[PDB]
Design an enzyme around this catalytic site. Structure first.
Site, PDB file in Angstrom:
ATOM      1  N   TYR A   7      -2.710 -65.419  30.664  1.00 33.08           N
ATOM      2  CA  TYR A   7      -1.513 -65.670  29.869  1.00 33.08           C
ATOM      3  C   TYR A   7      -1.144 -67.142  30.006  1.00 33.08           C
ATOM      4  CZ  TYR A   7       3.154 -64.745  27.876  1.00 33.08           C
ATOM      5  OH  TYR A   7       4.280 -64.710  27.087  1.00 33.08           O
ATOM      6  N   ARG A  13       5.690 -62.484  28.362  1.00 35.05           N
ATOM      7  CA  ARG A  13       5.276 -61.097  28.208  1.00 35.05           C
ATOM      8  C   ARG A  13       4.310 -60.592  29.270  1.00 35.05           C
ATOM      9  NH1 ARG A  13       6.433 -58.429  23.989  1.00 35.05           N
ATOM     10  NH2 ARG A  13       7.729 -59.355  22.336  1.00 35.05           N
ATOM     11  N   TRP A 103      10.817 -67.244  19.098  1.00 37.89           N
ATOM     12  CA  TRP A 103      10.266 -68.086  20.150  1.00 37.89           C
ATOM     13  C   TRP A 103       9.318 -69.175  19.658  1.00 37.89           C
ATOM     14  CZ3 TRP A 103      13.032 -67.234  24.298  1.00 37.89           C
ATOM     15  CH2 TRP A 103      13.538 -65.948  24.544  1.00 37.89           C
TER      16      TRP A 103
HETATM   17  N1  LIG Z   1       3.452 -57.611  21.516  1.00 36.07           N
HETATM   18  C1  LIG Z   1       2.387 -58.385  22.142  1.00 36.07           C
HETATM   19  C2  LIG Z   1       2.665 -59.876  21.860  1.00 36.07           C
HETATM   20  C3  LIG Z   1       1.372 -60.723  21.704  1.00 36.07           C
HETATM   21  C4  LIG Z   1       1.841 -62.187  21.435  1.00 36.07           C
HETATM   22  O1  LIG Z   1       2.423 -62.484  20.383  1.00 36.07           O
HETATM   23  N2  LIG Z   1       1.525 -63.069  22.393  1.00 36.07           N
HETATM   24  C5  LIG Z   1       1.847 -64.494  22.239  1.00 36.07           C
HETATM   25  C6  LIG Z   1       2.365 -65.083  23.561  1.00 36.07           C
HETATM   26  S1  LIG Z   1       4.027 -64.502  24.003  1.00 36.07           S
HETATM   27  C7  LIG Z   1       0.567 -65.268  21.918  1.00 36.07           C
HETATM   28  O2  LIG Z   1      -0.552 -64.757  22.072  1.00 36.07           O
HETATM   29  N3  LIG Z   1       0.746 -66.290  21.066  1.00 36.07           N
HETATM   30  C8  LIG Z   1      -0.308 -67.268  20.766  1.00 36.07           C
HETATM   31  C9  LIG Z   1      -0.763 -67.064  19.332  1.00 36.07           C
HETATM   32  O3  LIG Z   1      -0.228 -66.140  18.656  1.00 36.07           O
HETATM   33  O4  LIG Z   1      -1.671 -67.814  18.929  1.00 36.07           O
HETATM   34  C10 LIG Z   1       2.331 -58.128  23.671  1.00 36.07           C
HETATM   35  O5  LIG Z   1       3.292 -57.576  24.218  1.00 36.07           O
HETATM   36  O6  LIG Z   1       1.238 -58.515  24.306  1.00 36.07           O
END
Ligand SMILES: N[C@@H](CCC(=O)N[C@@H](CS)C(=O)NCC(=O)O)C(=O)O
Ligand SMILES: N[C@@H](CCC(=O)N[C@@H](CS)C(=O)NCC(=O)O)C(=O)O
Ligand SMILES: [Ca+2]
Lengths: 198, 198
Positions: A7, A13, A103
């Protein structure tokens, strides 16, 4: 089992998974990537999102799906199927709210407008519902701690960063936060984890 | 046990629960409220949201938490703990995207615009990830149908209303929809359920 959590460098998360590992006394690799190396990693993931958890070479995704996987058959899941449903529901209610915040919004004015709207109008309503749900009980579900309590402490921590007075009318919700932070394994994690804003 | 499902007169977030009851041949009260009923109904909800499912006098909330509860110990849950996690993950990934839409946006102009942008610029990436994930397999997880398949058919049904060509590049995802729609119990429900837009 050999666990590797990937992460960004923040609670975000992935924190709920980190709390579960700490509580259960399970060793794992807390892999925190830098934004610079995300593009590459993202392209190799089935759904391109993090966190992800590698279990003995097998990759799992979705933080709450992973959290549930790790808590099944443990004292953190709920004492009955109905109570397990209650735990899943509280977690989803919290996730729903936290997910309402933009966010990733680059538009600062649009971002600040929604944050202030959610914190000023919506948050108070949620805090009231949670407080009523909790009543005078020690934990949110049943007579013992569940990962739903963990998620409450985790989500509220981030909400308090933007709205310090969030719980001024809810001492019972504050006490729940403290009860979770007082758990030995959790307190130890909170004390050693990387200090990040989110 | 006695079951009472409360939701609006639409498929929406209660449909996954309705599919499970149909598949499992379980009787339940499908209570559909009118907008005019909302103020009174909402006053009885733990977190002001529907659907809720009353089971022998106790209230459960959160559509997916309820769906998971209803499928526990059934052939729809997933054959292993790992597969059960995959089922949860796919469902949450779908739910995440569906939640991106401004379903409650008052201004129709802005709403339509955001819908069109989401289905054109974002949906394609999710459709490809799901298609790739499914590969040449019969179902999304394991060797038999799970509620994750039900959720795919349910979510795509609604998306197709706003983006008819959503799956033109993914025949394998269309075949999956057809297989779910072909399950006798599900087919019967689909044919008899109230016809609503959403
Ligand atoms: N609902 C999913 C959320 C997945 C998500 O949106 N993760 C974000 C980080 S908080 C991420 O991967 N963002 C980078 C991107 O979308 O490229 C969970 O709980 O794992
Ligand atoms: N993630 C929740 C969402 C619950 C939800 O937002 N339900 C909507 C109807 S689709 C509702 O009750 N809205 C009333 C409101 O927002 O005040 C679920 O799956 O049950
Ligand atoms: Ca969710």
């Amino acid at each position: 089992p050999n666990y590797k959590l990937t992460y960004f460098n923040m609670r975000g998360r992935a924190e709920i998974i980190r709390y579960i590992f700490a509580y259960l006394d399970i060793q794992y690799e807390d892999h925190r990537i830098e934004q610079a190396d995300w593009p590459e990693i993202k392209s190799t993931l089935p759904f391109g999102k993090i966190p992800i958890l590698e279990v003995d070479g097998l990759t799992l995704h979705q933080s709450l799906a992973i959290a549930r996987y790790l808590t099944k058959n443990t004292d953190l899941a709920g004492n009955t199927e109905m109570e397990q449903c209650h735990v899943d529901a509280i977690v989803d209610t919290l996730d729903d709210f936290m997910s309402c915040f933009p966010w990733a919004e680059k538009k600062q004015d649009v971002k600040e407008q929604m944050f202030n709207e959610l914190l000023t109008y919506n948050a108070p309503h949620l805090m009231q519902d949670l407080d009523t749900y909790l009543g005078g009980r020690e934990w949110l579900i049943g007579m013992s701690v569940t990962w739903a309590d963990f998620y409450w402490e985790i989500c509220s921590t981030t909400l308090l960063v933007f709205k310090p007075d969030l719980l001024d009318n809810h001492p019972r919700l504050v006490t729940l936060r403290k009860k979770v932070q007082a758990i030995p394994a959790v307190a130890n994690w909170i004390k050693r984890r990387p200090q990040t804003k989110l």
